[PDB]
Amino acid sequence: QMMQYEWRKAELIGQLLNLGVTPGGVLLVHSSFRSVRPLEDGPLGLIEALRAALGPGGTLVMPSWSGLDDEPFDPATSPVTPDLGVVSDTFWRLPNVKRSAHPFAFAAAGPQAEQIISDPLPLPPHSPASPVARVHELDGQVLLLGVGHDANTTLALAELMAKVPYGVPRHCTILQDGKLVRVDYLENDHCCERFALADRWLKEKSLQKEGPVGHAFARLIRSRDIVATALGQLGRDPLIFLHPPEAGCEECDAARQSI
Ligand SMILES: CN[C@@H]1[C@@H](O)[C@@H](O[C@@H]2[C@@H](O)[C@H](O[C@H]3O[C@H](CN)CC[C@H]3N)[C@@H](N)C[C@H]2N)OC[C@]1(C)O
Ligand SMILES: [Zn+2]
């Protein structure tokens, strides 16, 4: 890399429309700016383009969780976990952006933002009555921006809706009446590598639009299409996302013992 094209706002809008983003809808965005860059206006230019594509009637949504099990969450100050990217960390600090008030936070901006983020602490994080399920309920679109289905949180929601038989102990920390309270729960967590199987599943039914957004390979799928397709596979095999024991994956092995 050396003298690469720095996409302007109008071009990014065109790439988003050409990919299938429709005005006035709900759009959940997972992004890796390292794949998107360089843009003319940096990470902020990507957010501005996403919102200009959705128009004033649409709602931009992004993950916003802190990734910290032992610290309480503050929607006004808690940084997002570094694994979510700089765009998610910057998005929630912008004006009029709403954020959920629990460590498994999402952020949203638009006429439907508070229908998406105004739920209390969900257990498990991606259960119903959580932001990722509200996006599914609101029939929104999911856009992966330089990341694969290993970052498609909607697939973890599909795992729960299938009542998948694995669940490992996890915990977070909240502030109740001024004292730090830890909250233990069971999460359907593994290595997430085999989430990539959704590529072939969704493409075989022609449910995944692909194209460039900036410099990144972008995948655009409906939330209902992600859940329905994943449920169809989990209905054939609930352990489809876990590595076989021969693979030696520690985390998937831990999920297998939890059954
Ligand atoms: C906030 N609680 C979290 C807990 O929810 C969990 O979150 C997992 C995360 O650890 C996994 O991370 C796993 O996969 C990563 C790459 N995708 C690499 C690291 C691996 N442990 C994610 N794949 C799925 C999350 N829901 O990670 C442990 C934790 C920090 O206690
Ligand atoms: Zn694994």
Residue numbers in the entry: -1 to 257
Sentences from the paper on this structure:
Here, we conduct a comprehensive functional analysis of the Antibiotic_NAT family of aminoglycoside acetyltransferases. AMEs permanently alter the AG substrate, preventing them from binding to their target, the A-site of the 16S rRNA in the bacterial ribosome. The fold typical of the Antibiotic_NAT family is evident in all structures, composed of 13 α-helices and 8 β-strands, and determined structures superpose with pairwise RMSD’s 0.8–1.0 Å between 197 to 266 matching Cα atoms.
To understand the structural basis of the highly promiscuous nature of group 1 Antibiotic_NAT enzymes, we pursued structural characterization of the AAC(3)-IVa representative of this clade in complex with AG substrates. Using this strategy, we were able to determine the crystal structures of AAC(3)-IVa enzyme in complex with gentamicin or apramycin to 2.6 and 2.8 Å, respectively. In both complex structures, the electron density corresponding to the AG molecule localized to the cleft between the major and minor subdomains of the enzyme. Additionally, Glu185 appears to be a critical residue for interactions with gentamicin and apramycin as it positions the 2-deoxystreptamine ring for modification through interactions with the 1-N of gentamicin or the 5-hydroxyl of apramycin. Interestingly, Cys190, which is just N-terminal to the Zn2+ binding site, interacts with the 3-N of gentamicin. The analysis of the AAC(3)-IVa•gentamicin complex allowed us to propose a mechanism for this enzyme’s ability to recognize 4,5-disubstituted AGs. In the complex structure, gentamicin’s 5-OH pointed out of the enzyme’s active site. If similarly oriented, 4,5-disubstituted AGs would not cause a steric clash with this enzyme’s active site.
